[PDB]
């Protein structure tokens, strides 16, 4: 017979001991551990909500891949990707390039806790999380690999994060800040709690649904499977936060959550928002990006923050408001600067789509609809040349994204500048500038693409030069997803 798991589980995490041949601080350096004065004994109260043992893991994860890889091989020669909507295809290329290697990097972020966490239970769970991200990085390379002969863009699934293309810089800015350069406790909070439990756990659920709605079962199976692993290791932040509040560190806990959530939000506003409000066909849009955020992200954050004795971030209302603008600014930026990304941005501003947008965002056409009016007329009158840039947009020195906002009638674009130690910084929001000020030593000498351009680090110092600097060439350089098909509807 076998023992019941509950009868022996505790022993698997009864691994802390009192160092003697080296000191505790030597064994667990604060910069990597982040125990923050809390005793080892106190960190031992850490108790993971989702437990799992080695044997259960290898068995269950074996079947998950058996299924995912079996689905992929069964539909392989079906070549769905060839008849899929360009908005969808673009959605996948953006997804893989932006995330494949960050998934792999997350295994190191997990390894950080697995090694330096004073909480024994956190160390084992992080070992499994490490294994999960290893899977995620690998499976999200194996799948897109199937399309490399279709377009060079699929090569960015692997190449993207190795380039200085602006979106790649933005991604690395986020990820490195949240998980690669933080102590163990900080990672469990900013990454597993704030980003995974807070955003991706649900996003992936919605992504898997859209893939299914798009007819891409291979991709839907992929995302669903990955999501089940995330739902498991994302739990690590909860207990860390309780322990910090439970002691004398509620402020530190609060500050990390505030930073983490805002940064996750910014990245989210450029990578997900545009997709559901413009790339997914109108008939396949369940809800708007704003609705999705409220019904599946904001209510949960408040829920969670309450159970932990934490407060809503000071920027919560602004955040609530920004759900009506930000992602529209990000989409317009990406589309207008489409040759600077590796996927084909879908305009999504046809008559049918334009009213859907006014319906979901009253006041859209009065503001955003304006910029799009000009762009549309130019295309109708044979002036494409005016729908692509001849300069670089101002980049935020925190989220490394373009500083944009409400245009047209209700114009309200602003720049929260800041001069620090003889240099001028630009921020796309109050929160972005705050993130910097509360911890300037962490971002001080970093330079965004524009800073580098202004410093002469991009040569030749012109558009063509900026493109080579970002490793972009015709073939991968983005253009309108539906090849301006949506223009015919305007005479």
């Amino acid at each position: 017979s076998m023992l019941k798991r509950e009868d022996w589980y505790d022993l698997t995490r009864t691994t802390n001991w009192t160092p003697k041949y080296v000191t505790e601080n030597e064994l667990f350096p604060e910069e990597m551990s982040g125990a923050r004065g809390i005793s080892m004994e106190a960190w031992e109260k850490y108790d993971e909500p989702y437990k799992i043992t080695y044997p259960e893991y290898v068995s269950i994860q074996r079947e998950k891949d058996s299924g995912a890889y079996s689905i992929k091989a069964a539909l392989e020669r079906d070549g769905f990707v060839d008849r899929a909507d360009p908005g969808w295809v673009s959605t996948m290329q953006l997804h893989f390039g932006a995330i494949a290697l960050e998934e792999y990097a997350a295994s190191t972020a997990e390894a950080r806790m697995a090694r330096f966490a004073k909480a024994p239970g956190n160390r084992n769970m992080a070992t499994f999380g490490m294994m999960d991200e290893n899977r995620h990085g690998q499976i999200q390379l194996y799948f897109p690999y199937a399309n490399v002969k279709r377009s060079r863009k699929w090569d960015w699934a692997h190449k993207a994060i190795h380039t200085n293309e602006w979106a790649a810089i933005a991604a690395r800015s986020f990820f490195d800040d949240m998980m690669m350069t933080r102590d163990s406790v900080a990672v469990s909070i900013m990454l597993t709690f704030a980003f995974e439990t807070g955003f991706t756990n649900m996003q992936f659920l919605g992504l898997a649904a859209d893939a299914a709605e798009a007819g891409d079962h291979t991709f839907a199976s992929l995302i669903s499977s990955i999501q089940t692993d995330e739902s498991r290791h994302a739990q690590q932040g909860g207990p860390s936060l309780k322990i910090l509040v439970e002691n004398g560190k509620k402020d530190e806990a609060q500050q990390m959550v505030d930073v983490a959530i805002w940064r996750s939000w910014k990245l989210f506003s450029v990578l997900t928002g545009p997709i559901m409000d413009y790339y997914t066909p109108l008939e396949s849009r369940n809800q708007s990006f704003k609705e999705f955020m409220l019904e599946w992200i904001v209510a949960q954050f408040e829920r969670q923050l309450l159970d932990l004795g934490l407060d809503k971030p000071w920027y919560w209302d602004q955040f609530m408001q920004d759900l009506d603008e930000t992602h529209h600014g990000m989409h317009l930026g990406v589309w207008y600067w489409r040759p600077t990304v590796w996927w084909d941005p879908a305009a999504g501003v046809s008559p049918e789509e334009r009213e859907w947008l006014e319906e979901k965002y009253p006041g859209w056409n009065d503001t955003w609809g304006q910029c799009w009016d000009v762009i549309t007329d130019n295309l109708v009158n044979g002036k494409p040349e005016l729908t692509v840039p001849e300069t670089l947009p101002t980049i935020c020195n925190m989220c490394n994204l373009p500083i944009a906002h409400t245009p047209g009638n209700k114009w309200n674009v602003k720049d929260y500048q800041l001069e620090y130690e003889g240099r001028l910084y630009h921020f796309g929001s109050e929160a972005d500038r705050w993130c910097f000020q509360i911890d300037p030593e962490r971002y001080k000498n970093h330079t965004n693409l524009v800073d580098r351009f202004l410093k002469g680090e991009i040569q030749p110092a012109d558009l063509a030069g900026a493109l080579m600097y970002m490793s972009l060439e015709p073939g991968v350089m983005g253009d309108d997803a539906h090849d301006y098909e949506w223009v015919k509807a305007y005479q």
Binding site: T15, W17, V22, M131, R152, H158, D176, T181, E441
Partner: protein, 323 residues
């Protein structure tokens, strides 16, 4: 316009079609793209400095660590198929030996031997788990990291076996202290202090090269020969066929770790000067390994002989690598 390739662009230049292993495991670390500023933040952050000092400035050098290849070519998908089979074997043993009451027929002398020399290893195994997971996050190439990734999982696997087994033992012999006394034994029994000092010091060797050497080349063979080989061989003799078989089943993982470690050293020896760098680290750590083996095996029956064989077998591991 760029024409699509048949494989990843960084693999375009191979004579043979890339394997799944190469497709999902190569050139994935991006922190090595900017040695002057590994992470996309201020170049003076503590973590920026940690990677420059412990990864980039390691004396163990090579112009292309990304060229490393795992001889077993493990990927997550094949790692699980492999281990799920091995766990079906081990878990089957637990279940069926339990069924025939294997523990009840162990002698009192042996049960006490298990309390002192067997169950406390949960601390040493987790220590190796910590040791290898650190190698994971500081190694210069994704193919090297992955080997450390799977090895970490195996270490957690050994810990797990031990944890489960400690529970079963505490059930049939509740007065021995199984499950409760391991920590104090690991911390105070002279038989364990050799290994404890070794791993505690090894755990703070931050240089990726020295970490690899201290953990994979020196500490592990010493732990594997003492705890799996010797204690396991003794278990068989004393009528404990479960531990005898369990230890041999774990040796299989240990042998796989040796295989990739041997490959990494081989690659390292391609560059002039690395052999000397490795021998200097081995020369530094070997003395602690000897001490660990002596303190452990001497306390075992026919102790002196266990010491000679362990020392000999562990040194043979490095000899076969050219050192």
């Amino acid at each position: 316009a760029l024409k699509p390739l048949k494989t990843w662009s960084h693999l375009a230049g191979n004579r043979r079609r890339p394997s799944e292993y190469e497709v999902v495991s190569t050139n994935l670390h991006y922190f090595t793209d900017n040695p002057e500023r590994p992470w996309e933040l201020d170049s003076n952050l503590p973590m920026q400095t940690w990677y420059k000092k412990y990864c980039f400035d390691s004396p163990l050098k090579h112009d292309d660590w990304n060229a490393f290849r795992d001889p077993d070519q493990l990927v997550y998908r094949t790692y699980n198929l492999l281990q799920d089979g091995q766990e079906s074997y081990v878990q089957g043993l637990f279940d069926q030996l339990n069924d025939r009451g294997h523990d009840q027929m162990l002698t009192r002398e042996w049960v006490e031997t298990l309390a002192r020399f067997y169950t406390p290893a949960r601390y040493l195994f987790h220590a190796l788990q910590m040791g290898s997971v650190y190698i994971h996050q500081i190694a210069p190439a994704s193919t090297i990291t992955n080997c450390a990734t799977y090895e970490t999982a195996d270490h957690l696997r050994w810990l797990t076996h031990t944890a489960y087994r400690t529970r079963e033992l505490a059930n049939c012999y509740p007065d021995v202290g199984f499950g409760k006394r391991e920590r104090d034994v690991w911390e105070n029994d002279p038989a364990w202090q050799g290994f404890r000092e070794l791993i505690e010091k090894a755990l703070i060797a931050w240089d990726w090269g020295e970490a690899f050497t201290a953990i994979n080349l020196v500490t592990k063979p010493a732990v594997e020969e003492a705890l799996l080989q010797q204690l396991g061989s003794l278990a068989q003799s004393e009528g404990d066929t479960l531990l005898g078989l369990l230890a041999q089943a774990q040796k299989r993982d240990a042998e796989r770790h040796r295989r990739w470690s041997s490959a990494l050293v081989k690659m390292a020896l391609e560059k002039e000067g690395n052999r000397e760098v490795l021998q200097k680290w081995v020369a530094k750590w070997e003395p602690l390994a000897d001490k660990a083996i002596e303190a452990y095996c001497s306390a075992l029956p026919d102790g002196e002989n266990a010491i000679v064989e362990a020392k000999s077998a562990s040194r043979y591991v490095r000899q076969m690598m050219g050192l």
